[PDB]
Amino acid sequence: LPAPKNLVVSEVTEDSLRLSWTAPDAAFDSFLIQYQESEKVGEAINLTVPGSERSYDLTGLKPGTEYTVSIYGVFPYQYTMSNPLSAEFTTGG
Amino acid sequence: LPAPKNLVVSEVTEDSLRLSWTAPDAAFDSFLIQYQESEKVGEAINLTVPGSERSYDLTGLKPGTEYTVSIYGVFPYQYTMSNPLSAEFTTGGH
């Protein structure tokens, strides 16, 4: 999986940021977005947007605050099942 | 994946069946359960039940009716992601 590219930002308000990026066409099924305050001792907020988008608007933010933001490209493959276990069952009446 | 084993049923009513099975611990994320009427042509219904569960009750069934019942152990396993694209962006006004 080659990565997403060139993450940029627009619409900088006190409480919101619009993320824009570039990914290869129809490559990723999903986009994982992580963000947290840079100064906050804690763990990130995880978001998920379909592999079709190229922009997203972070909301609920704090004024004048710096946020470390990372975006991953995701692509599933294997879901695997077992061999079926079959039976014929008959109700009552 | 290893397998679910020994499908049996208990508590049979005129409209319900309690399924039960054995499976090794911590292998499956879920179990897929298919059921349909044996004769009458049409679609089967698929349910997922959590992978810690070793029994289930089918409901909304018909009297004196036979059901083809199948159960698969499942894992929605392997994701792969790219290396993160990180950046530091800052809000306005302070």
Residue B75 φ/ψ, nearest 5 degrees: -140, 115
Experimentally, the structure was elucidated by X-ray
Here the tokens at position A37 are 């305050």
Most B-contacting residue of A30, A82, A86 (CB-CB within 10 A), to test interface? A82
Q: How many CA atoms lie within 13 A of B38 on its CB side?
A: 12
Here the tokens at position B38 are 């044996």
Task: Determine contact, residues A81/B73, Cβ cutoff 8 Å.
Answer: yes
Residues in chain B after which the chain is broken, C→N over 2.5 Å:
none
Domain assignments of chain A as residue spans, ordered by start: 1-93
Q: Do residue A67 and residue B91 have CB atoms under 8 angstroms apart?
A: yes
Task: Determine contact, residues B44/B33, Cβ cutoff 8 Å.
Answer: no
Residue A2 φ/ψ, nearest 5 degrees: -65, 155
- CATH fold label, A1-93: Immunoglobulin-like (2.60.40)
* DSSP type of residue A16: -
Resolution in A: 2.8
The CA distance from A70 to A46, in Å, is 10
Here the tokens at position A77 are 């493959």
Distances, alpha carbon A53 to alpha carbons A18, A21, A29, A32, in Å = 12, 9, 10, 11
Place of tokens 């840079």: A38
Q: Do residue B69 and residue A89 have CB atoms under 8 angstroms apart?
A: yes
Task: Determine contact, residues A11/A18, Cβ cutoff 8 Å.
Answer: yes
Task: Determine contact, residues A51/A29, Cβ cutoff 8 Å.
Answer: yes
Here the tokens at position B36 are 């349909």
Q: Do residue A70 and residue B79 have CB atoms under 8 angstroms apart?
A: no
Domain B1-94 - what CATH class?
mainly beta
Most B-contacting residue of A11, A40, A83, A91 (CB-CB within 10 A), to test interface? A91
